Design an enzyme around this catalytic site. Structure first.
Site, PDB file in Angstrom:
ATOM      1  N   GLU A 126       0.775  -0.724   0.056  1.00 31.37           N
ATOM      2  CA  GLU A 126       0.013  -0.212   0.070  1.00 31.37           C
ATOM      3  C   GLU A 126       0.995   1.343  -0.295  1.00 31.37           C
ATOM      4  O   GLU A 126       0.521   1.982   1.045  1.00 31.37           O
ATOM      5  CB  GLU A 126      -0.878   0.008   1.323  1.00 31.37           C
ATOM      6  CG  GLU A 126      -2.295  -1.143   1.416  1.00 31.37           C
ATOM      7  CD  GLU A 126      -2.857  -1.207   2.729  1.00 31.37           C
ATOM      8  OE1 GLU A 126      -1.724  -0.780   3.261  1.00 31.37           O
ATOM      9  OE2 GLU A 126      -4.143  -1.830   2.426  1.00 31.37           O
TER      10      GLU A 126
HETATM   11  C1  LIG Z   1       0.803  -5.844   3.937  1.00 32.38           C
HETATM   12  C2  LIG Z   1      -0.738  -5.135   4.958  1.00 32.38           C
HETATM   13  N1  LIG Z   1      -0.675  -4.172   4.840  1.00 32.38           N
HETATM   14  C3  LIG Z   1      -1.662  -3.677   5.279  1.00 32.38           C
HETATM   15  C4  LIG Z   1      -1.731  -3.284   7.214  1.00 32.38           C
HETATM   16  O1  LIG Z   1      -0.965  -1.841   7.396  1.00 32.38           O
HETATM   17  C5  LIG Z   1      -3.584  -3.254   7.644  1.00 32.38           C
HETATM   18  O2  LIG Z   1      -2.790  -3.041   8.680  1.00 32.38           O
HETATM   19  C6  LIG Z   1      -3.899  -4.422   6.905  1.00 32.38           C
HETATM   20  C7  LIG Z   1      -5.644  -4.529   8.005  1.00 32.38           C
HETATM   21  O3  LIG Z   1      -6.015  -5.374   7.752  1.00 32.38           O
HETATM   22  O4  LIG Z   1      -4.417  -4.552   6.476  1.00 32.38           O
HETATM   23  C8  LIG Z   1      -2.693  -4.564   4.637  1.00 32.38           C
HETATM   24  S1  LIG Z   1      -1.775  -5.990   4.989  1.00 32.38           S
END
Ligand SMILES: CC1=N[C@@H]2[C@@H](O)[C@H](O)[C@@H](CO)O[C@@H]2S1
Ligand SMILES: *[C@@H]1O[C@H](CO)[C@@H](O[C@@H]2O[C@H](CO)[C@@H](O[C@@H]3O[C@H](CO)[C@@H](O)[C@H](O)[C@@H]3O)[C@H](O)[C@H]2NC(C)=O)[C@H](O)[C@H]1NC(C)=O
Ligand SMILES: *[C@@H]1O[C@H](CO)[C@@H](O[C@@H]2O[C@H](CO)[C@@H](O[C@@H]3O[C@H](CO)[C@@H](O)[C@H](O)[C@@H]3O)[C@H](O)[C@H]2NC(C)=O)[C@H](O)[C@H]1NC(C)=O
Ligand SMILES: CC1=N[C@@H]2[C@@H](O)[C@H](O)[C@@H](CO)O[C@@H]2S1
Lengths: 54, 190, 236, 440, 52
Positions: free
Chosen positions: D235
Site C-alpha cells: 500500500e
Molecule cells: C501488508 C498489509 N499492509 C496493510 C496493513 O497496514 C493493515 O494493518 C492491514 C489491515 O488488514 O491491511 C494491510 S495488510
C-alpha cells in the site's frame, strides 16, 4: 470531561478543585431519609472511594 | 481549592433495603463545589448512578494531583429498561464472570440482567423442587448454578441497582428439560 | 427417535410448570419472569397422533398457532396467579394470543421491526427492543457505530404509543460465547447501547461519542474490565 | 504393560545452539509398541515437533489413569514456512503476550513468527543507532517500548521452540511514526504550490534517506539472526509523491517520466542492495511484484490480496510462473472477523489450487495467518487468535488430503479443550463445553 | 491430534504411564545428547504440561 453515558444536562466550569485520598469523605447529608444503617449505600460509599482513587 | 466531602442526600423514602423494579426512580442531581460537593436523588438508585457519574469526573493532572472541575449535573435515564442478555446454557459461564459483567453494567448504567439461564443444550439451573433437571440436563455436575450461586448474583446485582430478570424459555428451546422430566417433551414419530 | 417441544396436551405438564414457576417466584425477587416462546417448531406436534386428537377436542383444526397460544396462555395465568408479571418473545404476540394488560413483548426480529414496534404499542402492550443490537453477531470494523446509530423511537404511533416503549437490550447469545471471549466481545460494544438508552435522543455526534468512548473504554480496563479497543491507540 | 521412558534420538547434529532456518528439517518418527518407545528425528527441530505430537497422544480414562497408545507415526511439514503475523504497532503488545503467543505457535507446529513491529500510528522499537525514532514515535517512551533486551528475549524464546523470527520494518509506506525523530525522511505533501502539513511515504529523492536506511538496517540485521528480513512495500501511495514539486524534479533527471512505479523501484532496489550487503535475504509484500519493480531473483513474494489486481490464486500462479517463491496470506486474515465458525473458511483453502507445473508449484514455500492490530490488543488477542489460526496451522503442515471438515472439527475442538487445560484463553468452536472450563 | 500427521498408524492397544516416575532420555547413538539446550528445556517444559 469523560462521561459515559452522557448525562441529560452537563454544565462545566474551567475552575478546578483538588481532592485528598486520606482526607476525602462520602457520607449522608443530615437531612436524608437514608443513613449509616443503609447497607446498600455504605457499600457503594466504600467501593467508589476505591474507584475514584485506587 | 479543595473538595473535602461529597454528601449523599436521599430526598424521598430511600428504598434502601429493596430490590429495584421497572419503575425505580434513578434520577439524581450533582453539585461539585468547595469545600463540600453534594449529590442528591429521590431514591437510592439515583445516588448509585450519581456516584458512578462522580467517579468519572475526578482525574489526575500532569503531576498526579487529584482534580475535579466544579460543575452542576442533572440527570435521569431516557429509558427505564436497559438490559444485557447473557446465555449461560449454550456455554456455562463461571459465576465470577457474571459478577464482572454486573460491575461492567454498573459502570455502564445498565439496570437489567436478562439471564437466559437454560436451553436445548444444557440445564445448569439447580432446582430445589426438581433436582433431576440439573442432575441429568446440565453439561456436567460441576457445570451447575446452585441456589447460593444464584442467590449471590441477585444480591450482587442489587448492590449496583441491577434487576435480575431470569428467562426459562418455553415451549421451544427445552430439549434439556426432558433429560430429567419424563414425558414432558412431545416425542417425534415419523 | 428425537423429541420435540414441551407437550401442551397433558396436565402432567402444567402441574409441573406450576410447582416449578412457584419456585422461580421465590428464587427471583423481580416482578417479571421471561417465559420465552420463540422459534416454536410445529414439525413434531403435527406428526403426533395423541396431539392430533387434542386438536379436534378443542376444534383448533390444524392451526398450530392456536395450540401454541393455548399453551402460552395456560402459563401466563400461572404467573399472574403468583403475583408476577411476564415478558415474552414476539412470536407469542404474533401467533394471535390473549395477553393480560401489562405483559411485556420483546421484539427481536429484523424484518419490519419498526412495524412490529407499531403493532405491539397500538395493541396497548409495553415493548422492549433487542432486534438491532444482536451482540453475538460479530463483524470486522467499528460496528459499535451501527448500534449507536439506532433510534428506537423511529416508527408509526401517537405520542401515547411511545410511552409504551420502555427500553432495550443488548444480546450476547452463547453459541460462540463463553468465559474466554465474553468480556472483550460485550464491552465496549454494549456501552454504545448504554448511552443510546440513557442519554437524550439528540446525543448522536460521532466524533464526540468516539472521543468519550475511547476514554471510557480505558477507564473500564483500569477497573479490571477487559473491554476491547475501538481502534488503534492506547491507555495510560 | 506400562511405559516409563521416551527415547529421543537425533541423527543430524547441528547442536541445539544455532537458530532454525527455512531449510531446516522437521521430520520425525514416533514408534511406540511393546518392544519400544522411540521418538526418532533427523534434526533437533523435528524432535520438538515429535514431542508435541507426543504430549497430545497422552490421555486418561474416566478413572484418571494416564495412558498412551500403540502408535506408529512418520510425519513432516507440507510447507517449510508456516508462520504467524503479529501487529505490535496499531496496539502495543506486552512481552508476556508475545511469549505466550509463541507457546501456542509451538503446540500448533507453526515455525515463523512474523513480527510487524512498526507502522503508521506507533514506533515501539527502540533503535540505538537512531534513539529518537522510538523516543518520539512510540505511544509512550517508557511503557510501550521494545528494548534491545525485550527483542533478544523474543528471539531466544522463539528459537527454543524452533520458531524463526521474521522482523518487519515496513518501508516506504506505513511510516508516519518515523516522521518525528528523523526529520526530512517523509515526503511533505503539497496542495498546489505550498506544503499542506500532511506527510506521505518515505522520501526517495533525498540522499539523507538512503544514508538513514543504510545505518538503520545494519542495526536491524545485527539484531535479528534469521537469514531473511521482511521489508514490506504494501500500500504505497503515489498521491503524496506526485503532489510534491521537488520530487517531480528528481523524476525528470533520472528520466522516470510520470509513473511512480519505477520511482518506487528506485527506492526498493537501493534498499534491497543495502540489506543484501549485510548477508540477509528478504521477503516482500506482493505490491512490489505487481508494480513491476526490478527485484532480485531470490526474493520472496507474500501474496495478501484477494481480488484486485488479480485473484489471489492467480497471483500465486503469476508469481511462480515468473520464478519467485511465494507466501500465501490472502485468505487467512484473522483480523477480519465474522459471525459463526469462520475457521472452516481458513481450513478449506488449498494453496496449490492453480495452473502450474510440479516445480512451478514447488516455489510455494508456505504462508502466514495475519493478526493485524487495528481492533486488537492485549485485551482480545488470545481468544481471537486461537483456535482460528490452528485451521491454518494444519492446512500448512498436514497433507493436501486431510480436508474433511467433520474430522477437522472433531479434533480441533478436542485440541481446544487441551489449549484450555494449558491455560490458553481459546474461544469456543460451537455450542458445548470443556469439563475444565477456562477460569482466570 | 493437531495438526494431523502425514502417516499416523493408530491402535487401541494401550500402555500405562507414571506421571512422576516418567522420563525423557537421549539414546546413546543420538547426535543430540545432554547439553542440547533446545531439548534440555523442551524435556522439562513438556513434563510440566503432561503432569504439572
Ligand atoms: C501488508 C498489509 N499492509 C496493510 C496493513 O497496514 C493493515 O494493518 C492491514 C489491515 O488488514 O491491511 C494491510 S495488510
Ligand atoms: C523428510 O520427509 C520428506 C517427505 O517425506 C522426505 O522426502 C521425500 O523422500 C522421498 C523418498 O525418496 C522422495 O520421493 C522420491 O522422489 C523422486 C523424485 O523427486 C522419485 O523419482 C523417487 O522414486 C522417490 O519417490 C520425495 O521426493 C521426498 N520429498 C517429499 C517432499 O516428499 C525426506 O526424505 C525426509 N528426510 C529424510 C532425510 O528422511
Ligand atoms: C486408544 O485405545 C482406547 C481403548 O480402546 C480408545 O478408547 C476409547 O475411545 C473409543 C472411541 O472414541 C470409545 O468407544 C466409543 O466411542 C463411540 C463414539 O462416540 C461410542 O459410540 C461408543 O459407545 C464408545 O464410547 C471408548 O469408549 C474408549 N475406551 C474404550 C474402553 O474403548 C482410544 O480411542 C484409542 N485412541 C485412539 C485415538 O484411537
Ligand atoms: C431472541 C432469540 N432467540 C433465538 C436464540 O435462541 C438463538 O440463540 C439466537 C442465535 O444468536 O437467535 C435467536 S435471538
Amino acid at each position: 470531561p469523560a462521561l459515559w453515558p452522557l448525562p441529560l444536562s452537563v454544565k462545566m466550569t474551567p475552575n478546578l478543585l483538588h481532592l485528598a485520598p486520606e482526607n476525602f469523605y462520602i457520607s449522608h447529608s443530615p437531612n436524608s431519609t437514608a443513613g449509616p444503617s443503609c447497607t446498600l449505600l455504605e457499600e457503594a460509599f466504600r467501593r467508589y472511594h476505591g474507584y475514584i482513587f485506587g | 481549592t479543595q473538595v473535602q466531602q461529597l454528601l449523599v442526600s436521599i430526598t424521598l423514602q430511600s428504598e434502601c433495603d429493596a430490590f429495584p423494579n421497572i419503575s425505580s426512580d434513578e434520577s439524581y442531581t450533582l453539585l461539585v463545589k468547595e469545600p463540600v460537593a453534594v449529590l442528591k436523588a429521590n431514591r437510592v438508585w439515583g445516588a448509585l448512578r450519581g456516584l458512578e457519574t462522580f467517579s468519572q469526573l475526578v482525574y489526575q493532572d500532569s503531576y498526579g494531583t487529584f482534580t475535579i472541575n466544579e460543575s452542576t449535573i442533572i440527570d435521569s435515564p431516557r429509558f427505564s429498561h436497559r438490559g444485557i442478555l447473557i446465555d449461560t446454557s449454550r456455554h456455562y459461564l463461571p459465576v465470577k464472570i457474571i459478577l464482572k459483567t454486573l460491575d461492567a453494567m454498573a459502570f455502564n448504567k445498565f439496570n437489567v440482567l436478562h439471564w437466559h439461564i437454560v436451553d436445548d443444550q444444557s440445564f445448569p439451573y439447580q432446582s430445589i423442587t426438581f433436582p433431576e433437571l440439573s442432575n441429568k440436563g446440565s453439561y456436567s455436575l460441576s457445570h451447575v448454578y446452585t441456589p447460593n450461586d444464584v442467590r449471590m448474583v441477585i444480591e450482587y446485582a442489587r448492590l449496583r441497582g441491577i434487576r435480575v430478570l431470569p428467562e426459562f424459555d418455553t415451549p421451544g428451546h427445552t430439549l434439556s428439560w426432558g433429560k430429567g422430566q419424563k414425558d414432558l417433551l412431545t416425542p417425534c414419530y415419523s | 427417535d428425537s423429541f420435540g417441544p414441551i407437550n401442551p396436551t397433558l396436565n402432567t405438564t402444567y402441574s409441573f410448570l406450576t410447582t416449578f414457576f412457584k419456585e422461580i417466584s421465590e428464587v427471583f425477587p423481580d416482578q417479571f419472569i421471561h417465559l420465552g416462546g420463540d422459534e416454536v417448531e410445529f414439525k413434531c406436534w403435527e406428526s403426533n397422533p395423541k396431539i392430533q386428537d387434542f386438536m379436534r377436542q378443542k376444534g383448533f383444526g390444524t392451526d398450530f398457532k392456536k395450540l401454541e397460544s393455548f399453551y402460552i396462555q395456560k402459563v401466563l395465568d400461572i404467573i399472574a396467579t403468583i403475583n408476577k408479571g411476564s415478558i415474552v418473545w414476539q412470536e407469542v404476540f404474533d401467533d394471535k394470543a390473549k395477553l393480560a394488560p401489562g405483559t411485556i413483548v420483546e421484539v427481536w426480529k429484523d424484518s419490519a421491526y419498526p412495524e412490529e414496534l407499531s403493532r405491539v404499542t397500538a395493541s396497548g402492550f409495553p415493548v422492549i427492543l433487542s432486534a438491532p443490537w444482536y451482540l453475538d453477531l460479530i463483524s470486522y470494523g467499528q460496528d459499535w457505530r451501527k448500534y449507536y446509530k439506532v433510534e428506537p423511537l423511529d416508527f408509526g404511533g401517537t405520542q401515547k404509543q411511545k410511552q409504551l416503549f420502555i427500553g432495550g437490550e443488548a444480546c450476547l447469545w452463547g453459541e460462540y460465547v463463553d468465559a474466554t471471549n465474553l468480556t472483550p466481545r460485550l464491552w465496549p460494544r454494549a456501552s454504545a447501547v448504554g448511552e443510546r438508552l440513557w442519554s437524550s435522543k439528540d446525543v448522536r455526534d460521532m466524533d464526540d461519542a468516539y472521543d468519550r468512548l475511547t476514554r471510557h473504554r480505558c477507564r473500564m480496563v483500569e477497573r479490571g474490565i477487559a473491554a476491547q479497543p475501538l481502534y488503534a491507540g492506547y491507555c495510560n | 504393560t506400562l511405559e516409563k521412558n521416551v527415547l529421543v534420538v537425533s541423527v543430524v547434529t547441528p547442536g541445539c545452539n544455532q537458530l532454525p532456518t527455512l531449510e531446516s528439517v522437521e521430520n520425525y518418527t514416533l514408534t511406540i509398541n511393546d518392544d519400544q518407545c522411540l521418538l526418532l528425528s533427523e534434526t533437533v527441530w523435528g524432535a520438538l515437533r515429535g514431542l508435541e505430537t507426543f504430549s497430545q497422544l497422552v490421555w486418561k480414562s474416566a478413572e484418571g489413569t494416564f495412558f498412551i497408545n500403540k502408535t506408529e507415526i512418520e510425519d513432516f511439514p507440507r510447507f517449510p514456512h508456516r508462520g504467524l503475523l503479529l501487529d505490535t504497532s496499531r496496539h502495543y503488545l506486552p512481552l508476556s503476550s508475545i511469549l505466550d503467543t509463541l507457546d501456542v505457535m509451538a503446540y500448533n507446529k507453526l515455525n515463523v513468527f512474523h513480527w510487524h513491529l512498526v507502522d503508521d500510528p506507533s514506533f515501539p522499537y527502540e533503535s540505538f543507532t537512531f534513539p529518537e525514532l522510538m523516543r518520539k514515535g512510540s505511544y509512550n517512551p517508557v511503557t510501550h517500548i521494545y528494548t534491545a533486551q525485550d527483542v533478544k528475549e523474543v528471539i531466544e524464546y522463539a528459537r527454543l521452540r524452533g520458531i524463526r523470527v521474521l522482523a518487519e520494518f515496513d518501508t516506504p509506506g506505513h511510516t508516519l511514526s518515523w516522521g518525528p525523530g528523523i526529520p526530512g525522511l517523509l515526503t511533505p505533501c503539497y496542495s498546489g504550490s505550498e506544503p499542506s502539513g500532511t506527510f506521505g511515504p518515505v522520501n526517495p529523492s533525498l540522499n539523507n534517506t538512503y544514508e538513514f536506511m543504510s545505518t538503520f538496517f545494519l542495526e536491524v540485521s545485527s539484531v535479528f539472526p534469521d537469514f531473511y528480513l521482511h521489508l514490506g512495500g504494501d500500500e504505497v501511495d503515489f498521491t503524496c509523491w506526485k503532489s510534491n514539486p521537488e520530487i517531480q524534479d528528481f523524476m525528470r533527471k533520472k528520466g522516470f517520466g510520470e509513473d511512480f512505479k519505477q520511482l518506487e523501484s528506485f527506492y526498493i532496489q537501493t534498499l534491497l542492495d543495502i540489506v543484501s550487503s549485510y548477508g540477509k535475504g528478504y521477503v516482500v509484500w506482493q505490491e512490489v511484484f505487481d508494480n513491476k519493480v526490478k527485484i532480485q531473483p531470490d526474493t520472496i513474494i507474500q501474496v495478501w490480496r484477494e481480488d484486485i489486481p488479480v485473484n489471489y490464486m492467480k497471483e500465486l500462479e503469476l508469481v511462480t510462473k515468473a520464478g519467485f517463491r511465494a507466501l500465501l496470506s490472502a485468505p487467512w486474515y484473522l483480523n477480519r472477523i465474522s459471525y459463526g465458525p469462520d475457521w472452516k473458511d481458513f481450513y478449506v483453502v488449498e494453496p496449490l489450487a492453480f495452473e502450474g507445473t510440479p516445480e512451478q508449484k514447488a516455489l510455494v514455500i508456505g504462508g502466514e495467518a495475519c493478526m493485524w492490530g487495528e481492533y486488537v490488543d492485549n485485551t482480545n488477542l488470545v481468544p481471537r487468535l486461537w483456535p482460528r489460526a490452528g485451521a491454518v496451522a494444519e492446512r500448512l503442515w498436514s497433507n493436501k488430503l486431510t480436508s474433511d471438515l467433520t474430522f477437522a472439527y472433531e479434533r480441533l475442538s478436542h485440541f481446544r479443550c487441551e489449549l484450555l487445560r494449558r491455560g490458553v484463553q481459546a474461544q469456543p468452536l460451537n455450542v458445548g463445553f470443556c469439563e475444565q472450563e477456562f477460569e482466570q | 491430534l493437531w495438526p494431523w500427521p502425514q502417516n499416523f498408524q493408530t491402535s487401541d492397544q494401550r500402555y500405562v504411564l507414571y506421571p512422576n516416575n516418567f522420563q525423557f532420555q537421549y539414546d546413546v547413538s543420538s547426535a543430540a545428547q545432554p547439553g542440547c539446550s533446545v531439548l534440555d528445556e523442551a524435556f522439562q517444559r513438556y513434563r510440566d504440561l503432561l503432569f504439572g
